[PDB]
């Protein structure tokens, strides 16, 4: 099972590489990895299991974070729970949004304050565990989580988006989500 020890941290070059497209039909190994990734997210959000396994609560995970450079992401948002293979953002809203509390990441062992501005609405296409295609419209927190994970497969970390000069600057028109 996936543990914190399996999650690589900032400094490991794999986090900055562009993940490889995975085969379709989905291989049994990529299917198994996805299952284990979703299990990890669920375990991290169960108060008892999180304590037993000493896990940080997490709503999204990307294969690169396990040192597996593949375009596979898992999300479990407290409304959306699935594994996406070869996910792509087909379109997005003009309107942007950011989490009021900023963002974190299990691969980052320091607090990096500041707003991470992302698109409030996105249309994403992906293949599920069976290799069947899906086209979904996401918004708000779900959209934020998916963009955070897709960034991982493109070698991007959340703090790359923070305006170091003015970490809490809020443009015109940007929404704020307060969890
Ligand atoms: Ni992350």
From Swiss-Prot:
Cofactor note: Binds 1 Fe(2+) ion.
Residues that span the membrane, as ranges: none
InterPro entries per the UniProt record, alphabetical: Peptide_deformylase, Peptide_deformylase_sf
Presence of the UniProt keyword Metal-binding in the record: yes
Keywords: Hydrolase, Iron, Metal-binding, Protein biosynthesis
EC numbers on record: 3.5.1.88
PANTHER family, A to Z: PEPTIDE DEFORMYLASE, PEPTIDE DEFORMYLASE 2
Gene, per the UniProt record: def
Function of the protein: Removes the formyl group from the N-terminal Met of newly synthesized proteins. Requires at least a dipeptide for an efficient rate of reaction. N-terminal L-methionine is a prerequisite for activity but the enzyme has broad specificity at other positions.
SUPFAM superfamilies with a match to the protein in the record: Peptide deformylase
Pfam families xrefs: Pep_deformylase
Active site: 149
Catalytic activity: N-terminal N-formyl-L-methionyl-[peptide] + H2O = N-terminal L-methionyl-[peptide] + formate
Lineage: Bacteria, Bacillati, Bacillota, Bacilli, Lactobacillales
Binding site for Fe cation: 105, 148, 152
Alphabetized Gene3D superfamilies for the sequence: Peptide deformylase
Cofactor(s), names only, from the UniProt record: Fe(2+)
HAMAP family listed in its UniProt record: Pep_deformylase
Species: Enterococcus faecalis (strain ATCC 700802 / V583)
Similarity comment: Belongs to the polypeptide deformylase family.
GO terms under biological process: co-translational protein modification; translation
MF term (GO), any: metal ion binding
Full protein name: Peptide deformylase
Keyword Repeat set for record: no
């Amino acid at each position: 099972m996936i543990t914190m020890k399996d999650i690589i941290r900032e400094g490991n070059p794999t986090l900055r590489a562009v993940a490889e497209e995975v085969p379709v039909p989905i291989t049994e190994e990529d299917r198994q990895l996805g299952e284990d990734m979703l299990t990890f997210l669920k375990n991290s959000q169960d108060p008892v299991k999180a304590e037993e396994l000493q896990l940080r609560g997490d709503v999204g995970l990307a294969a690169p974070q396990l040192d597996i450079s593949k375009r596979i992401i898992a999300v479990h948002v407290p409304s959306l729970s699935t594994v996406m293979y070869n996910p792509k953002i087909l379109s997005h809203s003009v309107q942007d949004v950011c989490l009021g509390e900023g963002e974190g990441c299990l691969s980052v062992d320091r607090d990096v304050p500041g707003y991470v501005v992302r698109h409030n609405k996105i249309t994403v296409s992906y293949f599920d565990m069976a290799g069947e295609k899906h086209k979904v419209r996401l918004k708000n927190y779900e959209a934020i989580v998916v963009q955070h994970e897709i960034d991982h497969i493109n070698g991007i970390m959340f703090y790359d988006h923070i305006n170091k000069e003015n970490p809490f600057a809020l443009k015109e028109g940007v929404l704020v989500i307060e969890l």
